């Protein structure tokens, strides 16, 4: 009973900075489509590399574009079973604990409606979220509440302060949450 295959289940991911890339196990980000919809990378400080994640994978869970007031994407879907979105959060220049919270939802649905980079993680690095959704016969399913859904999920994330998601890593892949591997470069396994 062996299953491996994560480039071969994703469907819809998304690295608000740079413009497209392609991750080790073979994840691919598109080239801005929510700000803008055609242009080109943005880095304002680029100096400051993330410390839990690769050189490749650092650049999809470090670069970052610009931001406004109140937005998100559009993931279109047509299919059942156990969808999985994981998300990056980072942060460059702001540092303050339960002050600068922030909102995030999937397909018009609250789930994390407090979100402070600082005290999750510390000073920097990467921080994660794992959000498992579970479609059957045509209908939702998010945690613990029941709804049917219609066409697409959305993610739209709202204001703090000043900014609003800053750094984002969208990651949504298809059909459990025992099929995602996370693993650093080393050479001895035992
Ligand atoms: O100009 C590029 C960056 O602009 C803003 O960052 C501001 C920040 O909001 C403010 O608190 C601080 O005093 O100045 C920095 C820039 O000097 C945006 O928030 C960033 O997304 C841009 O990269």
């Given at each position: 009973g062996a299953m491996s295959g994560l480039a071969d289940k994703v469907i819809w991911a998304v690295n608000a900075g740079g413009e497209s890339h392609v991750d080790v196990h073979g994840i691919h980000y598109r080239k801005d489509?929510?700000?803008?919809r055609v242009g080109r990378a943005s880095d304002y400080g680029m100096k400051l590399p993330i410390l839990?994640?690769?050189?490749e994978d650092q650049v999809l869970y470090q670069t970052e574009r610009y931001n406004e007031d109140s937005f998100g994407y559009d993931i279109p879907i047509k299919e059942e079973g156990e969808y999985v979105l994981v998300l990056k959060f980072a942060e460059v220049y702001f540092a303050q604990s339960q002050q600068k919270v922030f909102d995030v939802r999937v397909n018009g649905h609250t789930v994390v409606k407090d979100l402070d980079i600082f005290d999750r993680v510390g000073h920097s690095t990467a921080h994660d979220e794992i959000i498992p959704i579970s479609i059957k016969k045509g209908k939702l399913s998010v945690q613990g509440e029941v709804s049917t859904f219609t066409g697409k999920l959305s993610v739209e994330f709202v204001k703090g302060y000043?900014?609003?998601?800053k750094v984002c890593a969208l990651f949504i892949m298809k059909?459990?949450?025992?099929?995602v591997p996370m693993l650093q470069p080393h050479p001895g396994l035992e």
């Open positions: 489509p929510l700000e803008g839990r994640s690769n050189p000043y900014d609003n998601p059909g459990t949450a025992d099929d």
